[PDB]
């Protein structure tokens, strides 16, 4: 039934040493992220470090990955804003660039200024009227922001577009049952995130796809072949194999996994986040590159 | 000695019913402000609803309120972003246009992305060596982040253009105490925020500016000249008669109470907020305007 | 209509210079307070320093200030914990020494450990069918714990102790409007806290008590007195010559508050907090007074 | 050279279905562990819901499971509160019971009530001036309170008794590659806990001991032990058998994960926690139980 399932790596944000963007190693790790297995991709999301980037330099991006995809696999493009009126403007902006989905966050910012459920129905009720693609409701801790599972399935079935979800709070699991429970046809697809590092359990709760990182999705990607087809054996395996690198990635190196692994293979030319977010620790990167070296991922043999 | 020093409220952003922006009832809310006797003026600050604006409305913003003001009254235009090289751009941007000062916020995004000291300081010192106009640092709840005493006298003292701090975390006069203390004549300007509502305090700690809401400096104004001039009963004569109007600001009507008064008064054509933000309650709204009403602001005569 | 309205400040807990109870200074704030004209108390509660008291500490001045109140005015005893057994036990233990109200925070701890909303509801459900006195919601930003006002009104139509509400939230005048609204008959006493600082605008939302702090009851409740006789014009002008004291307590001088002016009365021995909670601040500590002086307050001249 | 090191898993409270203390289960549960190689135990921290029970409780418990260890291991006990006074009292009463070290959070409450830096040094310095045993630091998220390496490393240098730390914080292992260089030798012992989430990057940045779950301290001690020994890649793969374990531990069963097993394998009576925690979904203990019958742990053969 579900348009889309499977794994959505988020694509990083590739800045030459100037700090500018470099376009060239963003086409090559788009190429990389889909020679891996990848059924879709997700941009400008936090893992792109989107709160670094300004509104030209996202149009860009919008364009330039979307061009260059040339309908390889579908995007996920994120739109997240403050103001309703932006989010939909950027969310039509992006399906008009031939978008198969938009991710949103709830309008919030920073580490005060919150948005009541009321009124954060009425900004996702507003996009979905804007456009005709679906939209995936992000429920991350970086919102600071409260969705419930009875009000993400009243979201789904209230409003139309909202068909997609991104659980990626504490205790994902649980909350994907009770979601898939009070949402029920609504509820088109059920993801998972957080870098995959609760993937297993969150299989088994009915997760259809996963939004990993964009270092090594043909590590990942076995696991939910495996579960759907019932092989839950090779899902405890795969997982087991490469949960020391999930692990890494999700508490070490972070965000700048997966292009410490991209410089590492010669996909970009430029490692480097945008100041002032540090720089990986020389020791943090050298245990991401032992542990990654033990698992053959094809980010390190593709140039 | 100090450059700069008095009332400098923050300038709102006035939407059409529609959204966009609203450009001309912007250029009346600026000479009504002026008009107020407000010693300078803040744009693009939280009382601005700088957060539901694009990039482009935030250059369009900033050239039309500079070219309108002509020099008046000296400007601080808000600069804040994640990027320390797109923060210093809108901050040589803003110089150029003639901006007197630049406030910026540390860099932060949402709930969960913060920034360790040793970068924070190295995004203020690249953001003055971009510009040669004082720099405000921001100590503000909505950032999230930490900045302690120590640290910030540390900046003002070891980079440039670092000499101006807004201080409104809770407890912000022992605060301006302790930075007063270990800063000294480095602290060119310790202020204060949050609409006025601990201004007395504030005064007593040594604050020689007040960024308040852009609603009534008329009405605030005097007690920072009865404290300059030694008036202490004067100034708290003053500061108990409006403190009512300050405390419905500050826990009732929030960023909309300066629009909610511009717009009762024919100074702006709405006072709607960008969506979803939440209008004003009308119970709120006809609680401010009764307060209002008993003090004669400028706002409600003026037009 | 309601059980109890009106003012219902916070007892602070009294300790000598090095940190022990001071009964003897616990029950002369009890006696002034009652002096000052409050319709009730509350002990127990943050500005009680309860977070910095041991469990028997706890008994103790449940014990003793039930015990010198003698029936006087009501007092409200705060039992939050996140046990809700330990609560329940709490709550008939009070009840059991004259207790009028308990006051419970939703089950939490420190900046982690929350509770979801159907174990929060079984929490007060159980608490409720512990006892046979009425039930204080306290919704506060101590909790770090969302309730929403449909949650809150389903709990006070559906569990029948949970009758009284302390809104402390941001924004908490329209909170108490939605409350009554959603919550009707089921809604005994909206009430307000933090000091009192947004009384004014709380009187307006329906609020008919106040938790405030203990240090000037009597400034506070005409403001109350004049809204229930309908001189809204008096509130205000009571309301507007306090405020600059009420803010000083919310903003500046804090739980301290309540302890410096009745230390400086000479009501109580000693106004130290348990370390280590920072001490007063010397300047925070004069504008405390110097504003107080304005207001002529009982607590500046009581003569027991 | 230091006093302790190795693995020191957390204790739980076994409470029975009615929640009452089920103290015939706890010093089973005490006995378990010991039996499964624990260096030493930590009692009264967050897997054990210290949050969930009363001071007297407390000290029963101190009494009972110090009587039943009998020395044969050091065990550390967490004081916490918010009053200085009443966590050296606590610190106190622990060590003439014979608690080898006590760990104690900064002092906080709740969601807003905060300390500033000055009075938590003179916190931790009281308490040590109170006792003549160690004092574990512990940063750990529930606290909200922020205390950087430098403060941390000040504190070991300057108050006697605080000699140990357990770093739970986000970057752990960055967090304490900082702290033990600036502690220098007055750091006696940098450990990590976190049910040994990050334990392979925190032995990589030098720590020296885990505070673990009580759930099985055999499968994760060998470890530390083939770390100590520099069999980096024995570590490895130790690590990797048991990380999804762990990882159930962390972010699914959480605090119940200790309780679940032992209850299974007869150690306790009941596994449930205090209400109003909530009670384990029954997907995730069928998860939790088929991942531990692949790793074969004492707990389910004891």
């Given at each position: 039934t579900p348009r889309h399932r499977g794994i959505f790596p988020v694509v990083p944000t590739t800045f030459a040493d100037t700090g500018e963007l470099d376009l060239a190693s963003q086409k090559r790790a788009v190429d990389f992220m889909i020679d891996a297995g990848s059924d879709g991709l997700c941009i400008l999301a936090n893992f792109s470090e989107q709160?670094?980037?300004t509104d030209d330099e996202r149009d860009v991006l919008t364009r330039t990955i979307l061009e260059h995809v040339a309908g390889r696999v579908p995007v996920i493009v994120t739109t997240s804003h403050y103001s309703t009126q932006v989010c939909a403007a950027r969310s039509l902006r992006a399906q008009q660039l031939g978008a198969a989905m938009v991710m949103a966050m709830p309008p919030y910012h920073g580490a005060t200024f919150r948005v009541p459920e009321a009124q954060i129905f009425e900004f996702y009720a507003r996009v979905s009227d804007a456009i005709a693609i679906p939209i995936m409701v992000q429920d991350a801790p970086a919102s600071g922001t409260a969705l419930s599972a009875p009000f993400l399935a009243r979201m789904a079935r209230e409003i139309e577009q909202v068909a997609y979800f991104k659980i990626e709070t504490p205790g994902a699991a649980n909350k994907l049952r009770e979601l898939i429970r009070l949402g029920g046809d609504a509820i088109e697809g059920p993801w998972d995130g957080?870098?995959?590092?609760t993937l297993l359990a969150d299989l088994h709760a009915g997760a259809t796809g996963a939004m990993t990182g964009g270092g090594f999705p043909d590590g990942i990607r076995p696991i939910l072949e495996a579960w759907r087809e019932g092989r839950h054996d090779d899902a405890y395996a795969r997982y087991q194999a490469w949960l020391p690198l999930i692990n890494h990635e999700n508490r070490?190196?972070?965000?700048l996994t997966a292009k410490a692994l991209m410089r590492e293979g010669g996909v970009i030319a430029s490692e480097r986040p945008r100041h002032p977010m540090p720089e990986l620790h020389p020791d943090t990167r050298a245990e991401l590159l032992a542990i990654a070296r033990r698992l053959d991922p094809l980010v390190l043999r593709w140039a």
């Open positions: 709160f670094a980037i957080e870098e995959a590092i070490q190196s972070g965000i």
